[PDB]
UniProtKB/Swiss-Prot annotation:
This is Phenylethanolamine N-methyltransferase. It comes from the Eukaryota. GO terms for cellular component: cytosol. S-adenosyl-L-methionine binds at residues 12, 17, 56-57, 62, 78, 83, 135-136, 158. The lineage of its organism: Eukaryota, Metazoa, Chordata, Craniata, Vertebrata.
Length: 258
């Protein structure tokens, strides 16, 4: 909470969504891997509905590129005002917005529906109805009278939980807190850092709870999820850059037992 007060959105984006990690040309990169996971999951047609909430969006939109064409009402969220402002600069196409075109383009490449990236970015901007404050540590993450339609048909969260919890236990409770926003039989698409303990965002150094695949699986189960899919990406040497000590990245497709 206090450590995140020095969090620099532009530095975070630069560290993880600009070359080399942000160079989507090589199919073995972490970016193409994450977009592939999201695309294939939605391509199954099993994850559908009207509303969807993205937990701890930070200043990024890539995690919703394949999702947007499946839900008409999308809520983006984040603990920091600076992030929500950054998200606004892109949704409004204001000056200085981050350029996600490489991710939009590759998402279109992977979905293989012959869509142009401008049409995809346009659908996302159109379907994002609101960017709200959020605290996964509160039993009621989005407050009491939130504008977001609850319960959501689906949830998506990337690099949030493990990046905001001191240990596994806090991680477990955080998952429980956001799981309350999801309707029974709903879907959760969780992406996160494997065995990572810190990552930089400008002047801020954030602590991370190093989690493993089994620990992530057991936690989803303990929260009442049937794990539909759970994949791991080992961070290659070329993408280890000193902005963190991440070892891998996991993707989980879990359905709320209900
Ligand atoms: N208590 C809390 N509850 C929810 N989000 C929190 C939080 N404390 C910090 N955060 C936010 O969690 C984010 C982690 S960075 C993740 C950004 C994006 N989802 C991606 O895929 O890269 C930051 O934007 C930070 O402000
Ligand atoms: N906390 C996010 C974590 O540092 C991270 C984010 C994105 C990556 O590609 C790799 C690692």
């Amino acid at each position: 909470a206090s450590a995140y007060q020095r969090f620099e959105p532009r530095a975070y984006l630069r560290n993880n969504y600009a070359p080399p990690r942000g160079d989507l040309c090589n199919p073995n990169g972490v970016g193409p891997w994450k977009l592939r996971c999201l695309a294939q999951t939605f391509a199954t047609g099993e994850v559908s509905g009207r509303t969807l909430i993205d937990i701890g969006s930070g200043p990024t939109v890539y995690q919703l590129l394949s999702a947007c064409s499946h839900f008409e009402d999308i809520t983006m969220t984040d603990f920091l005002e600076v992030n929500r402002q950054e998200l606004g600069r892109w949704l409004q196409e204001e000056p200085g917005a981050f350029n996600w075109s490489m991710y939009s383009q590759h998402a279109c490449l992977i979905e293989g529906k012959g869509e142009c990236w401008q049409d995809k970015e346009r659908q996302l901007r159109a379907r994002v109805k609101r960017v709200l404050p959020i605290d996964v540590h509160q039993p009621q993450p989005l407050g009491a009278g939130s504008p977001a339609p609850l319960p959501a048909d689906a949830l998506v969260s990337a690099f949030c939980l493990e990046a905001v919890s001191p240990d596994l236990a806090s991680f477990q409770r955080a998952l429980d807190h956001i799981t309350t926003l999801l309707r029974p039989g709903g879907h959760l698409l969780l992406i996160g850092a494997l065995e990572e303990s810190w990552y930089l965002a400008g002047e801020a150094r954030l602590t991370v709870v190093p989690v493993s695949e089994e620990e992530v699986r057991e936690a989803l189960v303990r929260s009442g999820y049937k794990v539909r899919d759970l994949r791991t990406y080992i961070m290659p040497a070329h993408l280890q850059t000193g902005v963190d000590d991440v070892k891998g990245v996991f993707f989980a497709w879990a359905q709320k037992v209900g």
